[PDB]
Enzyme design. Structure first.
Site, PDB file in Angstrom:
ATOM      1  N   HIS A 135      -4.268  -3.634   6.534  1.00 48.82           N
ATOM      2  CA  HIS A 135      -3.213  -4.175   5.639  1.00 48.82           C
ATOM      3  C   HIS A 135      -3.411  -5.731   5.464  1.00 48.82           C
ATOM      4  O   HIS A 135      -2.904  -6.374   4.527  1.00 48.82           O
ATOM      5  CB  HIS A 135      -1.830  -3.743   6.214  1.00 48.82           C
TER       6      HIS A 135
ATOM      7  N   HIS B 230      -2.165 -14.484   9.932  1.00 47.01           N
ATOM      8  CA  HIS B 230      -2.753 -13.644   8.945  1.00 47.01           C
ATOM      9  C   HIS B 230      -2.337 -14.181   7.593  1.00 47.01           C
ATOM     10  O   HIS B 230      -1.573 -15.119   7.528  1.00 47.01           O
ATOM     11  CB  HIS B 230      -2.259 -12.175   9.048  1.00 47.01           C
TER      12      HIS B 230
ATOM     13  N   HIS C 292      -1.539 -13.175   3.249  1.00 47.66           N
ATOM     14  CA  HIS C 292      -1.305 -12.253   2.124  1.00 47.66           C
ATOM     15  C   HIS C 292      -1.924 -12.853   0.885  1.00 47.66           C
ATOM     16  O   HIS C 292      -1.816 -14.100   0.718  1.00 47.66           O
ATOM     17  CB  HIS C 292       0.229 -12.046   1.892  1.00 47.66           C
TER      18      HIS C 292
ATOM     19  N   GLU D   4       3.900 -14.306  -0.933  1.00 47.34           N
ATOM     20  CA  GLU D   4       5.127 -13.494  -0.732  1.00 47.34           C
ATOM     21  C   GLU D   4       6.369 -14.321  -1.101  1.00 47.34           C
ATOM     22  O   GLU D   4       7.119 -13.954  -2.033  1.00 47.34           O
ATOM     23  CB  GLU D   4       5.214 -13.077   0.738  1.00 47.34           C
TER      24      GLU D   4
ATOM     25  N   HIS E  20       0.643 -16.864   7.318  1.00 45.38           N
ATOM     26  CA  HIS E  20       1.777 -16.664   8.253  1.00 45.38           C
ATOM     27  C   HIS E  20       1.287 -16.872   9.655  1.00 45.38           C
ATOM     28  O   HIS E  20       0.428 -16.103  10.111  1.00 45.38           O
ATOM     29  CB  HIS E  20       2.329 -15.249   8.104  1.00 45.38           C
TER      30      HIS E  20
ATOM     31  N   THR F  30       7.840  -9.038   6.714  1.00 44.03           N
ATOM     32  CA  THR F  30       7.647  -8.681   5.289  1.00 44.03           C
ATOM     33  C   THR F  30       6.825  -7.413   5.183  1.00 44.03           C
ATOM     34  O   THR F  30       6.565  -7.012   4.056  1.00 44.03           O
ATOM     35  CB  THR F  30       6.901  -9.803   4.539  1.00 44.03           C
TER      36      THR F  30
HETATM   37  C1  LIG Z   1       7.748  -1.583  16.698  1.00 48.27           C
HETATM   38  C2  LIG Z   1       8.156  -3.021  16.358  1.00 48.27           C
HETATM   39  O1  LIG Z   1       6.993  -3.704  16.041  1.00 48.27           O
HETATM   40  C3  LIG Z   1       6.998  -4.609  15.006  1.00 48.27           C
HETATM   41  O2  LIG Z   1       8.011  -4.870  14.432  1.00 48.27           O
HETATM   42  C4  LIG Z   1       5.759  -5.235  14.726  1.00 48.27           C
HETATM   43  S1  LIG Z   1       5.559  -6.360  13.543  1.00 48.27           S
HETATM   44  C5  LIG Z   1       4.002  -6.583  13.859  1.00 48.27           C
HETATM   45  N1  LIG Z   1       3.134  -7.373  13.166  1.00 48.27           N
HETATM   46  C6  LIG Z   1       1.677  -7.481  13.413  1.00 48.27           C
HETATM   47  C7  LIG Z   1       0.634  -6.286  13.404  1.00 48.27           C
HETATM   48  C8  LIG Z   1       0.194  -5.866  12.015  1.00 48.27           C
HETATM   49  O3  LIG Z   1       0.278  -6.801  11.026  1.00 48.27           O
HETATM   50  O4  LIG Z   1      -0.233  -4.717  11.751  1.00 48.27           O
HETATM   51  C9  LIG Z   1       3.708  -8.173  12.118  1.00 48.27           C
HETATM   52  C10 LIG Z   1       3.918  -7.687  10.804  1.00 48.27           C
HETATM   53  C11 LIG Z   1       4.362  -8.560   9.817  1.00 48.27           C
HETATM   54  C12 LIG Z   1       4.535  -9.945  10.038  1.00 48.27           C
HETATM   55  S2  LIG Z   1       5.012 -11.048   8.771  1.00 48.27           S
HETATM   56  N2  LIG Z   1       4.132 -10.662   7.419  1.00 48.27           N
HETATM   57  O5  LIG Z   1       6.427 -10.886   8.459  1.00 48.27           O
HETATM   58  O6  LIG Z   1       4.600 -12.419   9.250  1.00 48.27           O
HETATM   59  C13 LIG Z   1       4.344 -10.401  11.378  1.00 48.27           C
HETATM   60  C14 LIG Z   1       3.873  -9.527  12.373  1.00 48.27           C
HETATM   61  N3  LIG Z   1       3.492  -5.861  14.884  1.00 48.27           N
HETATM   62  C15 LIG Z   1       4.509  -5.089  15.355  1.00 48.27           C
HETATM   63  C16 LIG Z   1       4.149  -4.120  16.512  1.00 48.27           C
HETATM   64 ZN   LIG Z   2       2.809 -11.944   6.830  1.00 51.45          ZN
END
Ligand SMILES: CCOC(=O)c1sc(N(CCC(=O)O)c2ccc(S(N)(=O)=O)cc2)nc1C
Ligand SMILES: [Zn+2]
Length: 258
Positions: A62, A92, A94, A104, A117, A196
């Site tokens: 993703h 990372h 977007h 975003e 981010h 997000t």
């Molecule tokens: C079960 C609860 O777990 C979570 O909420 C998350 S969020 C999360 N990630 C990173 C890994 C990935 O991107 O696949 C994540 C996604 C978006 C953001 S963002 N786009 O809002 O900065 C930040 C971190 N990992 C986990 C395990």
């Molecule tokens: Zn992000």
């Protein structure tokens, strides 16, 4: 049939698995720069990345994530709108299929080519997975990218991408210094929001820098050669992995400047 950003599983669909998608503090948002309130009680942001220990770079299907050792206070964000100390866990981006879209957050409806981010978790909760369950669990530093002059501090990331082309590939990525991705000014907007991507949890204090960084057209073209699919699956270019602006609802965006 998991979530993504394709033609049938993109942001418009996510609410069916993750009902908080229609919640009261979802991200990203449009930042209407005239409506944002200057808050003279906001402090300068403190970004302390001198001891950052990057470990690895991962295509997660993703985006790509640059992961850091967060088992000690090594790379932390403090000050700004924050109480306490938040530890960098990963960064990372977007980005778009074209230079005209990809961010975003938007600024007076302007889309940037991409958005970085830097994800941090509040050390009062002990680890990232517990922090995401809390309303003040995470602080994400958002930096816009525009296409212009190259960002020299980005090039090490761009050059490793073809080693992680497909979903689930990773590569060692040590000694990367994320100070090389910052703009000169730390002026910012801040608001309470969410992750997000799914699971869309409402655990984020967003801090979005006013000043974008400039990256070259060749650098962002390399982001667009990555793949959402796994190795030996049909090629689906990893582009347009951004979620559109969501309703601001009952929230105020605050400015640290102005
Ligand atoms: C079960 C609860 O777990 C979570 O909420 C998350 S969020 C999360 N990630 C990173 C890994 C990935 O991107 O696949 C994540 C996604 C978006 C953001 S963002 N786009 O809002 O900065 C930040 C971190 N990992 C986990 C395990
Ligand atoms: Zn992000």
């Amino acid at each position: 049939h998991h979530w993504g950003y394709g033609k049938h599983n993109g942001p418009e669909h996510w609410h069916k698995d993750f009902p908080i998608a229609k919640g009261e503090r979802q991200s990203p948002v449009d930042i209407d720069t005239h409506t944002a309130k200057y808050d003279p009680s906001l402090k300068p942001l403190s970004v302390s990345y001198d001891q950052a220990t990057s470990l690895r770079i991962l295509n997660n299907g993703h985006a790509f994530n640059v992961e850091f050792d967060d088992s000690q206070d090594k790379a932390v964000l403090k000050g700004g709108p924050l109480d306490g100390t938040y530890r960098l866990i990963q960064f990372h981006f977007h980005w778009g299929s074209l230079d005209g879209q990809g961010s975003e957050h938007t600024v007076d409806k302007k889309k940037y080519a991409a958005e970085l981010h830097l994800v941090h978790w509040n050390t009062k909760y002990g680890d990232f997975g517990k922090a995401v369950q809390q309303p003040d669990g995470l602080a994400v530093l958002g930096i816009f990218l525009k296409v212009g002059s190259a960002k020299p501090g980005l090039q090490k990331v761009v050059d490793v991408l073809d080693s992680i082309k497909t979903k689930g590939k990773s590569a060692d990525f040590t000694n990367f210094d994320p100070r090389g991705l910052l703009p000169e000014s730390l002026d910012y907007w801040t608001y309470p929001g969410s992750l997000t991507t799914p699971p869309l949890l409402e655990c984020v204090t967003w801090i979005v820098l006013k000043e974008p960084i400039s990256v070259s057209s060749e650098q962002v073209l390399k982001f667009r050669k990555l793949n959402f699919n796994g190795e030996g699956e049909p090629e689906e270019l990893m582009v347009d992995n951004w979620r559109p602006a969501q309703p601001l609802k009952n929230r105020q965006i605050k400015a640290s400047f102005k």
